[PDB]
Amino acid sequence: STGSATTTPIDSLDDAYITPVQIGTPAQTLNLDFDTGSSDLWVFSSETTASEVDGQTIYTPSKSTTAKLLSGATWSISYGDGSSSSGDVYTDTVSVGGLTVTGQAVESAKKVSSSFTEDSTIDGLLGLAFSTLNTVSPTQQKTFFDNAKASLDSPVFTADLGYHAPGTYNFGFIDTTAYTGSITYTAVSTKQGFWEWTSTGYAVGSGTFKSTSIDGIADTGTTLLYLPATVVSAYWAQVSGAKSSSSVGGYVFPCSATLPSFTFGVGSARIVIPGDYIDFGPISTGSSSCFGGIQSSAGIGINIFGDVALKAAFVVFNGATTPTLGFASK
């Protein structure tokens, strides 16, 4: 089997991407944030504290003839940005882009943090990291991908995120029309439960490529590109007036700037992030200070190849017995 679903930026900055997901019988379609950096499929629901729902589409398990309470199971998750959610668990039929998984754990939110409430466009998350990170207790649950894997034509999914435009998540096949040149594959460590790999280095604009190992994770659920402070300083040093602001929470730059590109290495291959991709707009409405799309990972504890990097590539998440990642230009 295969599945293919369009993923759409939630706003004009590509702050996140939502992908329609069918849950239950008859189908309830929710727009979920596909997140290769976490491993819980959770949704706003009929159980979510009413004051914490503001415009989201909710899953109502009582209206699904295939919903079953997973007795005793609870979940609770905190994300890298400080947000969190928690609740109980159903199993139900879940379909993504024509690919159907029966008995998928659908984690129903009883509580969500303010940032989730305030984002009316995201109805929940669909985790695509390794199931070892799944937070369901006392019985850990599998991701949608892990459940689907054995049925897929090939044990892979691909992320093809658009810049200010829709893109695609495919499951079970590699669309050879969706990228240019060849796909370069690189080793993955699953030891922290992430799609963790090692970039071979970077270049800033038309500068010389610096060969250096940068361990980080391919994370569709993170908006920006977070890299070591040395790397990020070298990038922003090429932008007149750019500076790190403790009050704003990272590098800012004059909105009048033309940003240089940023290249990262994947083995001997190179993925080029156009400068425009690195512009996240005024720090506040009407401001002439703009927020940078490349930020320091110092303090996070891990480097993160988030949407800013991933949207510049066609990315293969290969979930074979020995997982690997693939990157192609597009």
Ligand SMILES: O=C(O)[C@H](O)c1cccc(Cl)c1
């Ligand atoms: O808004 C301003 O003051 C200018 O755009 C400016 C000048 C220098 C540095 C920044 Cl981040 C912004």
